[PDB]
Each structure stands twice: as C-alpha cells, then as structure tokens.
Design a protein around this ligand. Structure first.
Ligand code: SF4
Ligand SMILES: [Mg+2]
Ligand SMILES: [Mg+2]
Ligand SMILES: [Mg+2]
Ligand SMILES: [Mg+2]
Ligand SMILES: [Mg+2]
Ligand SMILES: [Mg+2]
Ligand SMILES: [Mg+2]
Ligand SMILES: [Mg+2]
Ligand SMILES: [Mg+2]
Ligand SMILES: [Mg+2]
Ligand SMILES: [Mg+2]
Lengths: 99, 151, 122, 138, 208
RNA sequence: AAACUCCUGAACCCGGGACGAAACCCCCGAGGAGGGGACUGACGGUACCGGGGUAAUAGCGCCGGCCAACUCCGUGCCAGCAGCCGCGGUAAUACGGAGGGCGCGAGCGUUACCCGGAUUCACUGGGCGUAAAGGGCGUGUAGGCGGCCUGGGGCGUCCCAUGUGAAAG
RNA sequence: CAAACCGGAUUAGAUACCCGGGUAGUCCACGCCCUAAACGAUGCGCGCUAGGUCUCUGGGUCUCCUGGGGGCCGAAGCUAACGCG
RNA sequence: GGAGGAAGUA
C-alpha cells in the first residue's frame, strides 16, 4: 500500500513536475448525501512527457521536494482538457471578489 | 362496569351585555382495561354535569384496541391539528411512560408497557383527541393478511 | 431547506449566553459593598427592598439583593455573592450569602436557616 | 424536468390510492417494472402490464383496495396506507446488512436494490446482503 | 443508617398494614386496626384527589418501608434490575428478598425485618459457616442461613424458632427448627409473594 | 411516640495474631536441569479471632400550581417571600413563629457549570399567503440534479475472509 | 396641478384638513441613487389529484374536439383558522 | 349573499 491515486493534471509548467488533481467521492458523515472532495498533488515527471490533459496515476513515493512526495506511475488517457477548463474556469471565477 | 378518568376540567366564559357567563367543559376517558376505551368532551354550565356529558359521549366513541402481550402491535405516527403523537411499543418490564394525558387513554385499554412522546402542540384537547384516532388507526397481524389478499 | 443547502452552509449552535457574568465562572465571590439604597420594586409591588452594590475580585461593579430580618452591612463591608434574580429588581442579578466574612446571618429564626446563616440554638 | 421518476411513480400511486381509482398510467423503465414485480409479489397491488398509450409506453397499475368500511366515510380501509420515497436524489441512502431497517416491526415492508437484484428487507437479510434502500410501504 | 423513628405512621400514611412491628402487627391494637387514617391533625378531613404523581410515589414508599431501606440502595439496587435482563419490575423484587436482613425474617428467626437486621448485624446469623454481620448481603442460591452455634442458645431465638415449629415458610425456603439452618432454594416471583404493590408504578415512578 | 419489663450488645477490656514472603544467598549437583537448608514486614500488635461487658449522635429542605405534603397566631403594599406565574391593598394554607405533615439522612439545601427537557438550528426531526422569514425582477459561470434502451470498467456502493482496532473503559 | 413659503377662515390655539397666490417638481435629452405594501406579502421547473362556469387568443367540417391565459364556486387533501383548490 | 371598481368636538 503505497497509495496509488489517479487524477487529471492541472499544469505542465514546472521542470520535471506536474499537478495531478485527484477527486474523492464519499458520503457526508452527517447527511446521507454522497459529496465530492478534491485535492491537488505535485508529481515527478523526469521524462517530461507527462503533460497537460494527461490523466495519470501517482504513488506515495519517497520525498522529492517540500510538497512533492509522490511519483507519477502510468497513463490512462491524454485527451482530457475539458476538465482542465473546470479548473481553469473555477480559478478564474475566483477573480470577481475584490475592489 | 367501566372506569372514568377526567383528563381536565377547565373554565370558559363569554362577555355578555353586563357581565360574563361562565361555562364548563370536561374530558373524561371511559375505560375498562379490556381494550375498549372511549373519549368524550361535553359542555355544561356546571361542573358535575359536563362529567355526565363527557362521561356520556365517551360511551359512544367506543374503540376496540388490540393487545399483544401487554403492549401495542406496531409503530405509529398520527398527527392531529398542530398536535403530534408517536407510539413505539415496548417489551414488558417498561411501564406506561407517557404524558399525564394519554397515559389514561392507554391505561384504560389494558396497556402496561408502551413507549411514547407527545410532540407539537401539547394542548390536551388536541393531544387526547389525536391519541384516540391514533389508537383507531392501529391494525393487527391478522388484518394485514385479510387486506393484502381476499379470496 | 434542501439537503444540498445543508452540507454547504450547515447549522449554527444556538450558543445561549450567561446570566451570571461575575466572570471566572466561580459560583461565589468576595467583594466590598459600596452602596445600600433600598429601592422600590416593579409595577405590581411597593416595598423597600434592601439592595446593595458590590464590586468583586472579578473587577465588576454590580448590585445585589439582601435578605432577612435586616442586617449590619454598612458602607465598607466585605461580603459574598450568589445567584438568582428578582422579578421586581431590573438590575439585580445576584444575591448575598450571609454568615460569611462580614455578611452576618439573621438573628431569631428557625424555619429555613441554611439560607440565612442561622445556627441551631437549644 | 422530472428529476426522480421512481418517486414520480410512488407519487403517482398515492394520488391514485388516496382518490381510489382503478388504473393510473406511468412511464415504464425496466427498473420500475421490476419494482412492481416485488411490490405486487406481495398484495399491495393486483398487478400491472406493459402497455402503450398515445403511441408511447406506459404501465397500467391495477391498484388494490381494501373493504368498504361501514358508517360515515365509507371509503375502504386503505391498503397502501403510506408509501414514501427514501433515497432522494438530493440524499441517497446506502446501507449494509447490520443496519437494514425493520418497517412497522414486520407489518410493513422495505424495498431496495442491490447487486444480486432488487429485494426487500426480510429478503435481503436472508442473503446476508444489503444495498440502496428505495422505499418502504405500510 | 435506618429509620429508627415512629413506625405505625408509615402504615397509616400509606393506608396499608405494613407488618413492621411484629406480634402486635396482627393483633387488634395495630394502629391501622385502631386508627386506620393518615395521622397528624387533618386525618378525618376530606382527602382531595390524589395527584397523578401521588399514587406512584406512595406505592414506591410502601415497598421502600416494607423492606426497611434507604433510597440510594433502593435506587442502586433498582438500577441493576433495569440493566439486568428480564422484567424490570420483579427482578427488583428478586434482589430485594435476597438481602440478608430480609431472609432471617422470612426464616422466622425474627418476626420483624427491623428486628432481624439487628440480629444479622450483631453476629448471630451464619451463612455457609461464616460470621456474616451484613444486612445488605445478596444471598445467592444454595446458601446455608443459620443461627451461629456460638450464639444458638439465647432466650430470643428459641422462642421465635419454636414460634415457627410448622409454619408455612415461603414457598422457596427450607426451614429446620432445632437445626436452626435454612437453605436458600430458588428465587422469588411476585406471584410467589403477594404484596399490596403495583410494582409497575415504581417503574413508572423511576422513569419520570 | 415516652416512661416501664425483658433481649442482644456499637464504644470499651483482655489473651492469641496473621495473608501479603519466597526468592536473590548456601549445599548436592556442571556456576545446567532438579532438589534440599536457612535470614527478611513500614503498613501493625493493624485486620481478624477467643472471652467479658453499657442502649448509646440526628440533622436539613419544603408544605399556592409545577411539586408529595394544613391549621393557628402576629403582621396589614409596611415587614417580606419569590425559579415562571405571582402572594401580602384585614379576616394570608405563600411573609415571621408554633403544632403538625411531606422528602432525604450522616447528610440536607443554595450557587455555578455540562447534556437533557429545547422537534427552541429540526440528519433522524421544522418552516417562509396573514404569525420571523420568497431575493424587486431577469440572464447566466462554478456547483447541485437529471428521460428510455444496450454493452463495458467497477469510482461511490454491497457481501466473505484476514490484519488492525493495545490494556484498562 | 402642486411639496416648501405667505395670507383668509374654523379653532381653546391650527405650524393641518377648506380657500386665494405660488417656487422647486411633474414634461424632454443625457448621466446618476436602485429604494418600496416591488404584493398574488405565495421563487423557478416538471409530473399526478373531480368537476361546473363567463371570457381573451389560435387551430381543426363546429351549441363538438383540442392548445395557451385571466376571473368566479367548489371533489379529495392541507392550515391554528381565514382560506387555497 | 359573495367581488370589482355623504361626519363640527374633546
Ligand atoms: S401492623 Fe405493626 S407496624 Fe403496622 S400499624 Fe400495626 S403495629 Fe404498627
Ligand atoms: Mg481539499
Ligand atoms: Mg412548537
Ligand atoms: Mg420533586
Ligand atoms: Mg396594605
Ligand atoms: Mg430535516
Ligand atoms: Mg394582522
Ligand atoms: Mg442574497
Ligand atoms: Mg480483535
Ligand atoms: Mg427649492
Ligand atoms: Mg447623482
Ligand atoms: Mg395519476
């Protein structure tokens, strides 16, 4: 059990590093509804061939950096940018709460 | 060969050209501890007269209540007006734990053990009147087979 | 509401507030009286209730009601504090325990004595 | 937009019992028909049959009614006294075996679905398997 | 530790003959067979309707006073019955007659539990050959309740042992006069010991 | 209830006197296995045991409804009681006292706090016409939700086994 | 026409209702406040639950059928009721 | 019967 996780990337913008976004789905310990919770991980792409849109797997790996303790494992599918939007648009919804 | 228990005796008046005219109403529960119960509510211009009218009327709203080893067969919620009541039966060794009002209603049916709780408006006239209807909506293990079949 | 509105917003603890804010939360307290101006009760009454304003080690300056056949509490007199209100005293939140420090009890009494610092005679 | 249509059925039922009627047409999904299969396999209903109205597929429900009670309001003692949706789309119910709910200490029912199929309370506990509670009828 | 006060008031206050004195109890000078009304001034005066909370307190007091006991033990030995499996109302009447100060009374070594407790406490009764001077002794089955041979010769026991001779002991005990030993058989039921108590009320009491 | 007769005998007195303590050590024996022998107690002359022997502390709250338990006297919007209602404005079952009664008992009451009772933050378990509550309306992003049928993966989900879930609770 | 302002009159007095005048405003172009008894004091969307009845608007060989609306009594049901339907 | 659109003063 070195915690394999699967999630969509979010960035390809840093050297040998990407941003897997994985999703957890579970009930609510108080309400019977089954809700979503998501979390962002930073991963190790030494081949620099894991890029945006790539739906990959990650593993609880040895420490690589401060917030980088997981390795990329393998690929699931690459053609998934419509999810990156849902990250690209959400963080751009974050825009309109200011002066 | 019955048993009268008065829920409450209260006082109502009405303004009149020069004063107020009191009247009385009562809530007795006819009982027997055989399962046959009865509830009434009679209006009188004097106390020991409503008790008759209340005692009367109840000897008419007769209700056959089933008994399974000293309690209630199933679980029922019955709301009436803003007053609500929920009756979960109890294995013996429990005791009629209910409000001072419905206790009478259940006692005079032969119930020794039953779990209860008043809910919503705890006005007795609403709370009583509801309990009877709750007891009336009761069924037994036999009526289900007669309902869900018919040959 | 909706089940969805709930997980997102949720409920709030009612969080009721205290009626004895003598601080610390201690049940009793020591303080020195400062005022004794017997004031008049609320609407449906008219007596000369015996009152006193106390300043506790909590640092708060608050009135307090006095009970029984008179007393001996003067301007400078260390006292106690207690709990309980008075329907007729809009501003009296506490009470005075007697038989402790300078708040002496009540002479001549036999019914109810724990409440007035009265011992058992003969 | 008709979000939960399983409950639409259940809702169609009550408003057809509580007014006492013979037929009451309802759109048919194979999941819905399997429900009546396990509803009518008791006696709450006479039965159903795949039909077709206005060139479209529905489901006649031969609602079952108790006996004409006597006196004022001679409407018969209602069979399906109370049917209500449970696993709402706003809150879906998933339970195992060691928590399947009894219904009217037996005198009721609790219809659910699981991997071995749609089943009821006392039926599910037999298999030692549980699943998403769909409804309950007393 | 116990009541130590006026007893016949109890019997009058509850309107039931509480058999606590002893031989005077069945005599025609039982205060109830003399003054059968609640004591204290307003006895003969019209007693108004019993509040629905009243009659459930008094039966609770009946049993409380029948066995001579406080109200912590009463509660604590009631909590156990509520938790212990079985009907709450008569398991409680089981762990009660199991009390040592009771048994001796039931064995006729004394005509009064109040009388019996003293004999228990004073080093006179013996269980399984041991000097048990505890009233609150949950007597278990198959136990050897007997008057201590070191004190099986007093001018009290024999009189009250003889006083039983061939008495209808409780249908759950085994009395041997002159042998002075009485074995605890099974354990009681309300149907085995009929008392003026609707014990269910004590439940309905201790549930308010 | 008292006095009274009888009955036992908490305290008291004497005599015995512990369990907890069998090993480290020594011998035979190989410094093994095994076995044999012996010193050691603060608690404590305590517990307990044997015998003798005196009836020998009872207090607190309440008594209008909630809330079990009533009368007298003085007081006369004063003195006061009081958790909500409230009572006392002459004939008080509420104040002060007594007689008595109720509840507990080596304890009884006050105050403070936590949960409840409070379905009075409603997951079980609530509402928004007139009671506090529908945004002044529209459009619309994220999110929530979604008609019928067939096949796949089995993420949530369900079932069995195994590990863990320490001890005390 | 008319807030504010002045005068007349009623009045116990009239900083008002009644009257004689009368500025802002109400009108137009542009840009602001964005508030309400903004009320049907009833959020939007969909399905099911008897009818009778006037009317606005389409269609179909028509005191007939059907689709979209506004009113009016009322089935069951709901509410504390009024009442909704 | 319901519904819509003439008083001087404390
Ligand atoms: S039976 Fe005994 S305790 Fe009861 S009143 Fe008679 S003498 Fe007194
Ligand atoms: Mg997160
Ligand atoms: Mg309420
Ligand atoms: Mg009480
Ligand atoms: Mg006066
Ligand atoms: Mg809820
Ligand atoms: Mg109004
Ligand atoms: Mg807002
Ligand atoms: Mg384990
Ligand atoms: Mg101007
Ligand atoms: Mg501007
Ligand atoms: Mg229908």
């Amino acid at each position: 059990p070195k915690k394999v996780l699967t999630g969509v990337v979010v960035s390809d913008k840093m050297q040998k590093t990407v941003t897997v976004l994985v999703e957890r789905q579970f009930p609510h310990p108080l309400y019977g509804k089954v809700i979503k919770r998501s979390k962002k991980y930073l991963a190790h792409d030494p081949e620099e061939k894991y890029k945006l849109g790539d739906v990959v797997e990650i593993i609880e790996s040895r420490p690589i950096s401060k917030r980088k303790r997981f390795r990329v494992l393998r690929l699931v599918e690459s053609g998934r940018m419509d999810l990156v939007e849902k990250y690209l648009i959400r963080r751009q919804n974050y825009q309109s709460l200011s002066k | 060969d019955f048993e009268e228990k008065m829920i409450l005796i209260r006082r109502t008046a009405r303004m009149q050209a020069g004063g107020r005219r009191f009247r009385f109403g009562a809530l007795v529960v006819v009982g027997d501890r055989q399962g046959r119960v009865g509830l009434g509510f009679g209006k009188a211009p004097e106390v020991p007269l409503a008790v008759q009218k209340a005692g009367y009327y109840a000897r008419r709203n007769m209700v056959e209540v089933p008994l399974q080893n000293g309690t209630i067969p199933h679980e029922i919620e019955v709301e009436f007006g803003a007053s609500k009541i929920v009756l979960k039966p109890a294995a013996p060794g429990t005791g009629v734990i209910a409000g001072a009002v419905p206790r009478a209603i259940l006692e005079l049916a032969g119930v020794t053990d039953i779990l209860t709780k008043e809910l919503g408006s705890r006005n007795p006239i609403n709370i009583a009147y509801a309990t009877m209807e709750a007891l009336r909506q009761l069924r037994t293990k036999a009526d289900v087979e007669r309902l869900r079949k018919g040959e | 509401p909706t089940i969805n509105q709930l997980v997102r917003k949720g409920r709030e603890k009612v969080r009721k507030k205290s009626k004895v804010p003598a601080l610390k939360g201690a049940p009793f307290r020591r303080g020195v009286c400062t005022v004794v101006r017997t004031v008049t009760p609320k609407k449906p009454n008219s007596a000369l209730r015996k009152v006193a304003k106390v300043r506790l080690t909590s640092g708060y300056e608050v009135t307090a009601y006095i009970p029984g056949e008179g007393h001996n509490l003067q301007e400078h007199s260390v006292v106690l504090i207690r709990g309980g209100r008075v329907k007729d005293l809009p501003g009296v939140r506490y009470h005075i325990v007697r038989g402790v420090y300078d708040a002496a009890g009540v002479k001549d009494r036999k019914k109810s004595r724990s409440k007035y610092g009265t011992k058992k005679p003969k | 937009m008709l979000t939960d249509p399983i409950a639409d059925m259940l809702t169609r039922i009550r408003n057809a019992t509580r007014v006492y009627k013979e037929s009451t047409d309802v759109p048919a999904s194979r999941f819905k028909e399997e429900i009546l299969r396990i509803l009518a396999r008791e006696g709450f209903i006479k039965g159903y049959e795949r039909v077709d109205v206005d060139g479209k597929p529905y489901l006649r429900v031969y609602l079952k009614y108790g006996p004409r009670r006597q006196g004022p309001d001679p409407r018969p003692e209602q069979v399906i006294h109370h049917i209500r949706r449970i696993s709402k789309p706003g809150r879906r119910v998933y339970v195992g075996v060691k928590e399947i709910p009894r219904v009217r200490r037996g005198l009721g029912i609790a219809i659910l679905s699981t991997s071995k199929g749609v089943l009821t309370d006392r039926e599910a506990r037999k298999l030692g398997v549980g699943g998403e509670l769909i409804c309950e009828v007393w | 530790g116990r009541y130590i006060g006026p007893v016949c008031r109890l019997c009058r206050r509850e309107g039931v003959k509480l058999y606590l004195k002893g031989e005077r109890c069945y005599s025609p000078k039982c205060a109830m067979e003399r003054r059968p009304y609640p004591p204290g001034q307003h006895g003969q005066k019209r007693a108004r309707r019993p509040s629905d909370y009243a009659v459930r307190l008094r039966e609770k007091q009946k049993l409380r006073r029948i066995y001579g006991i406080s109200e912590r033990q009463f509660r604590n030995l009631f909590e156990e019955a509520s938790k212990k499996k079985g009907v709450t109302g008569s398991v409680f009447l089981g762990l009660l007659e199991s009390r040592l100060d009771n048994v001796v009374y039931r064995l006729g070594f004394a005509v009064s539990r109040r009388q019996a407790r003293q004999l228990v406490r004073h080093g006179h009764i013996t269980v399984n050959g041991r000097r048990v001077d505890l009233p609150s002794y949950r007597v278990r089955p198959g136990d050897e309740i007997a008057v201590a041979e070191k004190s099986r010769n007093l001018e009290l026991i024999r009189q009250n042992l003889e006083a039983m001779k061939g008495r209808k002991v409780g249908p759950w005990l085994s009395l041997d006069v002159e042998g002075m030993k009485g074995k605890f058989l099974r354990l009681p039921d309300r149907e085995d010991l009929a008392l003026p108590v609707n014990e269910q009320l004590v439940i309905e009491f201790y549930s308010r």
